[PDB]
Amino acid sequence: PGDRCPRHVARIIAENDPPIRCDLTLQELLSEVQVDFEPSASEVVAMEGLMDEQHFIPHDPHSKKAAVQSLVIAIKTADLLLQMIHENVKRDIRTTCIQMANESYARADIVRDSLIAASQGKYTALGKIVFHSYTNFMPVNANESEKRAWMEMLGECTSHGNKLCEMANAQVEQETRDIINIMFKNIDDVVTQTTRAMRGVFDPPDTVKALSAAAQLIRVWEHDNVINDQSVSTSSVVTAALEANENLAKALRDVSGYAEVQFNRLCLSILTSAKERIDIIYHSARSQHLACNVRMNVAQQNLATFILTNARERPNDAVIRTRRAVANTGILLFTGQHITRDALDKAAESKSVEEIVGMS
Amino acid sequence: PGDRCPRHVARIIAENDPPIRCDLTLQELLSEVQVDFEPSASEVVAMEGLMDEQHFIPHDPHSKKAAVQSLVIAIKTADLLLQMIHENVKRDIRTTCIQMANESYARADIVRDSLIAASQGKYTALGKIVFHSYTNFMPVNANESEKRAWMEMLGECTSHGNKLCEMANAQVEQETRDIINIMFKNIDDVVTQTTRAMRGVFDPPDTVKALSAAAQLIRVWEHDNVINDQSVSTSSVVTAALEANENLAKALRDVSGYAEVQFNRLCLSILTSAKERIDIIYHSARSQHLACNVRMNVAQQNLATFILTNARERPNDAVIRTRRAVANTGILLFTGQHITRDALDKAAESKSVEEIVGMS
């Protein structure tokens, strides 16, 4: 279908074990012949006719037989409704949870595309900073053909610095992907936890007292007392079997009522907080991406002030100090650490690993 | 103080590294003599007097000296304000985060006491179920002195079943504690993540163009041009040094404005979602506790129907089947699994491990 759930998430949604039905089975209540009953059309109308207001004969074995059959039908119907109630509870949860899943993965892609949009953009902050304030670092003498050579030496430092921006774009791409993978993994966990939570809290009222009483009257009347054949008050048996069916109807309406009213309150309180924290998953991923970009912005400024200061103070060693600073601090960039100017200063003191081995 | 933070959480709040100041230092801008300036009272009034509307002499070396000193003071003041702005940003975050921490641990104890309240309550569901419907499982004969022996055999089964309730209380206590430890650990992580997030997003405007220009005029005037001693337009130097100070004031107000207005918007959006998901931590812990209690309620009902069915069908083997069912399924209880009646049925078939070795 249009399902976006991963492999293991659809497994957790597919399972139907957590909501467990603890009601008495038919085999504990009725005989195998009574389970395989399926009454004829006339037998049904005879049962339905007991609810009609009437005066009963002191010995009406036809109506007394319908009173026994009414209990068998009432129990069989009660069991079917209970299964349907449970099967209806499972079905609603899957529909609720799959809908929240697909709704959440949809917005996740919107966030994913939005994060890659800003991460593909190249870092120009270092170039802009030097370009706007390079004049305030030129020497005081400012001879005609002396400033042109200072600008050429500056360009060697700036080109060496843009290699750090190139490293920064490589890192922010890798981090953005790691951010996205955390986001989806989190959404997966929310959907998993939500489905199990709704099932885990389903605690319907028990139906033992209603079922056990109905199966006992059947056991008493059918073979021990043989009430239908002996002279016994028919109005007593009809009144007994009628209140027994209503006790079953009360129990089922009490159970279905819990599923419709009280249990539904729980599932909404779950779904709300589930929906709430998915919204947080989005906002969290966005601020993580922002915080990463801020770390790169910090490094460019520190490099910019490192370049401009060394360009004025040590214009002879500037290009070499810039190269050594960028190479010896780039490892800090890929390890996700910050790049302080103290680190840039102390790094320019040492030779790069590339020039030591001679790889370059 | 009244701090409830754990050991490692107060460490994360105490650190002040993540907000990094990248502004130009005084040593890159001024001479060591200019840093150690501390002007006399008359020198200050001379500087402040340049802003007064007046017509300047074509060569006023007294006012021109104050113009140079005004830049030195303007830079020194700018650096102090920038440090204070950062130190003010760190201070507000700690106050904001410690407050949210203590506010959250307070409600956590309220939840902790509330969960232990319901977990200390003993499980009586199995006893209640049998007590209300035991009559509907007595045999049909119902001889005078035959039902009294059936009740005694039932009591042996019920007492054996209350050992499972005793195991259930042991588990729900252990799980409730595990729930509480997860809750506090989660609150710890939220507080940690919140503090670092606010620091990680602080990205103030740079002050390079404003500082570099002011230090350059000082370098030009002081020793290269010697403007104060040579006949040079005084109104030109005052107008130059006045616009330089205002460029510094604009930059500081632009930086402080970001901290007060734009960065504060970020920290509130963080704090809100931080506060939001802590509320979820509470509601999550409560539903986990509920879902545990539901699993125990399921086991009691399955045992209750297992006891009542075996009491009517197999009253001779009931007590032994009950004992074997409870012992062979109790391991499922402590492993956190559900106790289906199918499991209770299949477990009563095998002897208990205790009766095999003879430990009992």
Coordinates of C-alpha atoms in Angstrom, one line a residue, chain A residues 18 20 22 24 27-28 129 132-133 135-138 140-141 200-204 206 208-209 212-213 216 219-220 224 269-270 273 276-277 280 283 287 290-291 294 297-298 301-302 305 308-309 312-313 338 340-341, chain B residues 18 20 22 24 27-28 129 132-133 135-138 140-141 200-204 206 208-209 212-213 216 219-220 224 269-270 273 276-277 280 283 287 290-291 294 297-298 301-302 305 308-309 312-313 338 340-341:
Chain A
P18 CA -0.6 -7.9 23.6
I20 CA -5.3 -10.8 25.6
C22 CA -9.5 -13.8 29.3
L24 CA -14.5 -18.1 29.5
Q27 CA -16.1 -25.5 25.9
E28 CA -16.0 -24.6 29.6
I129 CA 35.1 38.5 6.9
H132 CA 35.3 43.5 4.4
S133 CA 38.1 44.4 6.8
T135 CA 42.2 47.3 4.6
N136 CA 42.4 47.8 8.4
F137 CA 45.4 45.3 8.6
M138 CA 47.6 46.7 5.8
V140 CA 51.2 51.9 8.0
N141 CA 53.8 52.7 5.3
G200 CA -0.7 -2.8 27.2
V201 CA -3.4 -0.7 29.0
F202 CA -6.5 -2.5 27.7
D203 CA -8.1 -3.9 30.9
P204 CA -11.8 -4.6 30.3
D206 CA -14.5 -9.5 33.4
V208 CA -17.1 -14.5 34.6
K209 CA -20.2 -13.9 36.8
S212 CA -20.8 -18.9 34.8
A213 CA -24.4 -18.3 35.9
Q216 CA -25.0 -23.4 35.4
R219 CA -26.4 -27.7 33.6
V220 CA -29.1 -27.9 36.2
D224 CA -30.3 -33.2 36.4
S269 CA -3.9 10.5 26.0
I270 CA -1.2 8.2 24.6
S273 CA 1.8 12.6 23.9
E276 CA 3.6 15.7 20.9
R277 CA 7.0 14.2 21.2
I280 CA 9.8 17.6 19.4
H283 CA 12.4 20.7 16.4
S287 CA 18.4 22.8 16.5
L290 CA 21.8 24.7 13.7
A291 CA 24.3 24.0 16.5
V294 CA 27.4 27.5 14.7
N297 CA 30.9 29.6 12.0
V298 CA 33.1 29.7 15.1
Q301 CA 35.9 33.6 12.6
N302 CA 38.8 32.2 14.6
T305 CA 41.2 36.7 13.0
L308 CA 44.4 38.9 9.6
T309 CA 46.5 39.1 12.8
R312 CA 49.9 42.2 9.8
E313 CA 52.3 40.9 12.6
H338 CA 35.4 23.2 18.4
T340 CA 39.5 27.8 19.3
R341 CA 41.9 30.4 18.2
Chain B
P18 CA 30.5 25.8 24.6
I20 CA 33.0 30.8 22.7
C22 CA 35.8 35.1 18.9
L24 CA 39.6 40.4 18.6
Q27 CA 46.8 42.7 22.4
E28 CA 46.0 42.4 18.7
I129 CA -13.3 -13.2 41.2
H132 CA -18.2 -13.7 43.6
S133 CA -18.8 -16.6 41.2
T135 CA -21.5 -20.9 43.4
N136 CA -21.8 -21.2 39.7
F137 CA -19.2 -24.0 39.6
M138 CA -20.4 -26.3 42.4
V140 CA -25.2 -30.3 40.2
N141 CA -25.9 -32.9 42.9
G200 CA 25.5 25.5 21.0
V201 CA 23.2 27.9 19.1
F202 CA 24.7 31.2 20.3
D203 CA 26.0 32.8 17.1
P204 CA 26.4 36.6 17.7
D206 CA 31.2 39.6 14.6
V208 CA 35.9 42.6 13.4
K209 CA 35.2 45.6 11.1
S212 CA 40.0 46.7 13.3
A213 CA 39.2 50.2 12.0
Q216 CA 44.2 51.2 12.6
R219 CA 48.4 53.0 14.5
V220 CA 48.3 55.7 11.8
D224 CA 53.5 57.2 11.8
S269 CA 11.9 27.6 21.8
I270 CA 14.4 25.2 23.3
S273 CA 10.2 21.8 24.0
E276 CA 7.2 19.8 26.9
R277 CA 9.0 16.5 26.8
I280 CA 5.8 13.5 28.6
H283 CA 2.9 10.7 31.6
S287 CA 1.3 4.6 31.6
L290 CA -0.4 1.0 34.4
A291 CA 0.5 -1.4 31.6
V294 CA -2.7 -4.7 33.5
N297 CA -4.6 -8.4 36.2
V298 CA -4.5 -10.6 33.1
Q301 CA -8.1 -13.7 35.6
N302 CA -6.5 -16.5 33.7
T305 CA -10.8 -19.2 35.3
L308 CA -12.8 -22.5 38.7
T309 CA -12.8 -24.7 35.6
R312 CA -15.6 -28.3 38.5
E313 CA -14.1 -30.6 35.9
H338 CA 2.3 -12.4 30.0
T340 CA -1.9 -16.9 29.1
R341 CA -4.3 -19.6 30.3

